[PDB]
Q: What sequence folds into this?
């Protein structure tokens, strides 16, 4: 899979205006959603060469596990009885199924009109046996838990498979969750592409959205190095 | 509504402009009177002419502010259901069943 | 783009007032006929400016202007009465 | 409601619909009538072949991501859009050695034709029988009812 995207941001106060704009532009109001991601890295206690059976260089990378959680797990008592809609974001045995992903650093190129990232994904449906916890399974693969973050936001479905997410991110630790996006929302526009044509067509869709928001909110290509999960 | 208030204000401004025009006319004719040696209208000539300028100045202050309010309202009050159909028919249906 | 409307409107106001007073100065003061023609010109320009104000106002105005069980029971009746299957 | 739901959930993109799949207003509706006819003949057949033959017998018919607000609205009309089906249970007198049970189910899978499902079991664990049958033709249900009542239900 190839994910083409553009990012942006707005401060908490820009919320309502942005929601109103995206609602008119797309024709639909926002849809609330969340996801928990846990990132894993090769066990540092174990050490293996970084080469193939064909003696070809392999770069060590992180594995990302992601799933959803019922919203009720994110609403405490103070949050109680508050319209379960877009406005809520302001006031902020076996294993379960998971999405397993390994991504590559975005495609190189000066003057790229969008970010383009390859993503290898498979789906974990269930487990059984002695150590069936997703954690044990990751260890069995030779990986260890590194960090994890929660993301809550609203999304918009647009034409040609374009999706827009307005998100807030919180890292999770016993010491406490800290909001990586403290201050506002991370804006993301993207399309997932399973032929050159559809790639240039997808770029166009993103470019038209960028064009349509120019003046109001700017969408740009983030730094490749900021989208590289390789271990080092 | 708010838009109705804005439109009403604009209409009021139009009225003001009209007034300005009328008193422009008055001013002209009465200036014609003053040049002929009738000074009795000097109070009325200048009054209508001054009331014109005052009315025009008031309209200018009112109109310029209204334009500013429009610019400030961009994104706020101003842009930059089939479930309803169903309830109609169900209402209609239960009404047929129980007249 | 609205700032342009503000600028045009302000310029129009200044033009209107200035032209009014200045025309008022121009008369009182075929030279006389020429002066009359000039007066006609100024006045006409002023009127056109009024129409311009009207255009602006119109522009602004245009800117402003531009359960389940109940259903299951109800359908149960509807379908029954409609087939007339009872027939007994 | 369906097109919108089809757009909300899956596509990330646009709707996909079929007349045949999406066809039914009126055609789905007519079936309601034809089924009523079909059910009438079936009850006639049952009276003749069964009710009249075995004295105590009688018949009882019985009913067979978060968009959820939408699915609930559509679910409400499942009553109108379901393939019509009724189950006719035939009550038979209990023999003191064994209790025979017989029931038929009528349905219209394509909305305009009829399928008849007959289940019969009169267990005596020495004699125990079970039939699970499906017929598209009333002629054959008469023949099978006859066969059943003859051997198993009759004295």
A:
């Amino acid at each position: 899979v190839q994910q083409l995207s553009l990012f942006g941001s707005i401060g908490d106060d820009g919320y309502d205006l942005l929601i109103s704009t995206l609602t008119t532009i797309s024709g639909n109001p926002p849809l609330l959603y969340n996801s928990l991601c846990t990132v894993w890295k090769p066990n540092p206690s174990y050490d293996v060469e970084n080469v193939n059976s064909r003696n070809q260089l392999v770069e060590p990378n992180r594995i990302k596990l992601s799933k959803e959680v019922p919203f009720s797990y994110l609403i405490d008592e103070t949050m109680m009885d508050k319209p379960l809609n877009f406005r809520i974001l302001k006031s902020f045995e076996s294993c379960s199924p998971w999405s397993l992903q390994i991504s590559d650093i975005p495609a190189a190129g000066n003057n790229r009109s969008v970010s383009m990232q390859t993503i290898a994904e498979t789906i974990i449906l269930s487990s059984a046996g002695k150590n069936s916890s997703v954690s044990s399974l990751m260890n069995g693969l030779g990986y260890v838990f590194e960090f994890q973050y929660l993301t809550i936001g609203v999304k918009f479905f647009m034409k040609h498979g374009l999706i827009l997410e307005l998100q807030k991110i919180w890292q999770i630790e016993e010491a406490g969750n800290s909001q990586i996006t403290s201050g506002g929302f991370l804006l993301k526009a993207y399309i997932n592409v399973s032929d050159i044509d559809r790639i240039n067509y997808t770029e166009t869709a993103l470019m038209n959205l960028k064009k349509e928001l120019q003046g109001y909110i700017e969408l740009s290509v983030p730094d490749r190095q900021s989208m590289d999960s390789r271990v080092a | 509504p708010y838009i109705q208030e804005r439109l009403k204000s604009l209409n009021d401004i139009e009225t003001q402009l009209c007034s300005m025009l009328q008193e422009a006319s008055q001013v002209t004719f009465i200036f014609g009177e003053l040049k002929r040696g009738n000074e009795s209208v000097k109070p009325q000539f200048e009054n209508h002419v001054k009331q014109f300028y005052e009315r025009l100045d008031k309209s200018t202050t009112q109109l310029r502010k209204e334009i500013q309010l429009l610019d400030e309202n961009v994104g706020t009050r101003l842009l930059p259901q089939d479930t309803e159909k169903m309830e109609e028919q169900l209402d209609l249906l239960s009404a047929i069943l129980d007249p | 783009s609205n700032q342009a409307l503000y600028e045009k409107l302000e310029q129009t106001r200044t033009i209107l007032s200035v032209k009014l007073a200045e025309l008022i100065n121009m008369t009182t003061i075929a030279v006389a006929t020429t002066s009359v023609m000039m007066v006609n010109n100024q006045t006409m320009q002023l009127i056109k400016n009024v129409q311009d104000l009207l255009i602006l106002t119109r522009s602004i105005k245009e800117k402003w202007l531009l359960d389940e069980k109940q259903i299951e029971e109800l359908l149960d009746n509807c379908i029954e009465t409609f087939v007339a299957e009872k027939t007994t | 409601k369906k097109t919108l739901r089809s757009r909300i959930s899956s596509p990330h993109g646009l709707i996909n619909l079929n007349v045949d799949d999406d066809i039914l207003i009126i055609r789905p509706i007519l079936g309601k009538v034809r089924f009523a006819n079909y059910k009438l003949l079936l009850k006639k057949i049952i009276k003749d072949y069964v009710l009249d033959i075995v004295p105590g017998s009688s018949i009882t018919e019985t009913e067979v991501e978060n968009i959820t607000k939408l699915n609930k609205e559509i679910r409400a009309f499942d009553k109108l859009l379901n393939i019509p089906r009724r189950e006719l249970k035939i009550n038979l007198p209990l023999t003191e050695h064994k209790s025979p049970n017989l029931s038929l189910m009528l349905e219209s899978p394509n909305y305009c034709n009829a399928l008849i499902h007959i289940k019969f079991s009169a267990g005596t664990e020495a004699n125990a029988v079970s039939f699970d049958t499906t017929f598209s033709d009333f002629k054959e249900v008469e023949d099978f009812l006859h066969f059943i009542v003859a051997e198993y239900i009759q004295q």
